[PDB]
Design a protein around this ligand. Structure first.
Ligand SMILES: CC(=O)N[C@H]1[C@H]([C@H](O)[C@H](O)CO)O[C@](OP(=O)(O)OC[C@H]2O[C@@H](n3ccc(N)nc3=O)[C@H](O)[C@@H]2O)(C(=O)O)C[C@@H]1O
Length: 304
């Protein structure tokens, strides 16, 4: 019961943060005069995620000596684990940068609807890499989920919709791969979740900053690294840091496919709550989408 409530809490936080992240990230790119470098905000997230993970390792070990021993033996002591997790950190580095580029050129609703095609991609990656398997019924349910969530989800600055869509196309493919790669690495040994996060973000901060130099290196020398930062930009980075850590926790107790199903349910249930609580009005798209998600969960969760 205590493990279940903690599991349901991490899901609701992950989804609520994911909802507030795309709206806030959209806002910061379409209102500012001095526009900030999206590559820097991505990199600062990896620093903040790394620091919170180190904090959470100290809590998990619960001792200054065994906190030292864990970082010595697992992080520094295993160079092969760092080289492994440098792959999905490089994939995520691209993903997170494509996320900023997409929302700079597209609406949050438009982005959210298009980005649900990660669900098929994530199912495809899990079947190939992870050594799991799906029946024809469960394959029908994954697309039925995808269709259901797309229905649930339905600027004075210059924009480029087709560049935005190209970014989502890249981001969809990174999400399925890096998540399933991370789930594979996480669930292949006894190593702690916060150690796997630290091993990844160490590569993450290097690769993101390398990308930050290559992308906007000349213009940062003129403008500044923290050029265009604000309460809302630091808020976006804050949500990006928290949202990433929660997804790692969700992928531990759930999997990358069930992450889609569960998050869909959390969006459906919390909206139905807010319809009753806050008198929130909803569309027929949502009403329809909600049922597809419910059926897809039922069809997916059935014994072969
Ligand atoms: C910050 C946030 O809310 N991210 C959501 C993202 C979404 O892609 C964002 O637009 C940009 O990442 O989508 C979800 O998740 P998605 O699979 O794309 O996850 C991408 C984000 O999770 C972070 N991550 C992953 C594993 C790990 N061990 N540590 C991490 O920090 C990555 O660094 C990356 O930021 C989804 O499937 O709905 C859910 C995520 O919650």
């Amino acid at each position: 019961n205590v493990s279940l409530f903690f599991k349901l809490y991490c899901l609701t936080v992950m989804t609520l943060v994911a909802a507030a992240y795309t709206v806030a990230l959209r806002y910061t790119r379409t209102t500012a005069e001095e526009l900030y470098f999206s590559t820097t905000a991505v990199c600062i997230t990896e620093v903040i995620k790394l620091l919170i993970s180190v904090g959470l390792l100290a809590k998990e070990t619960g001792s200054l000596g065994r906190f030292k021993a864990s970082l010595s033996e697992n992080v520094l002591g295993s160079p092969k684990e760092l080289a492994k997790l440098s792959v999905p950190s490089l994939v995520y580095a691209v993903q997170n940068n494509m996320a900023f580029l997409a929302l700079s050129n597209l609406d949050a609703a438009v982005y959210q609807v298009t980005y649900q095609l990660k669900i098929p991609c994530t199912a495809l990656c899990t079947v190939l890499m992870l050594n799991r398997t799906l029946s024809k019924l469960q394959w029908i349910s994954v697309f039925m989920l995808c269709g259901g969530v797309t229905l649930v989800q339905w600027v004075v600055v210059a924009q480029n919709p087709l560049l935005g869509f190209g970014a989502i196309a890249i981001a969809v493919l990174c999400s399925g791969f890096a998540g399933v790669y991370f789930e594979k690495v996480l669930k292949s040994s006894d190593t702690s979740l916060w150690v796997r996060n630290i091993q990844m973000y160490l590569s993450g901060i290097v690769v993101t900053l390398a990308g930050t130099y290559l992308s906007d290196g000349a213009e940062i020398q003129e403008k500044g690294f923290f050029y265009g930062y604000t309460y809302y930009v630091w808020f976006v980075i804050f949500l990006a840091s928290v949202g990433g850590l929660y997804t790692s926790v969700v992928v531990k107790y759930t999997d990358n496919i069930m992450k889609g199903f569960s998050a869909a349910a959390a969006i459906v249930l919390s909206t139905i709550a807010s319809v009753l609580l806050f008198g929130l009005q909803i569309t027929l798209s949502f009403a329809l989408g909600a049922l597809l998600v419910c059926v897809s969960i039922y069809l997916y969760g059935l014994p072969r």
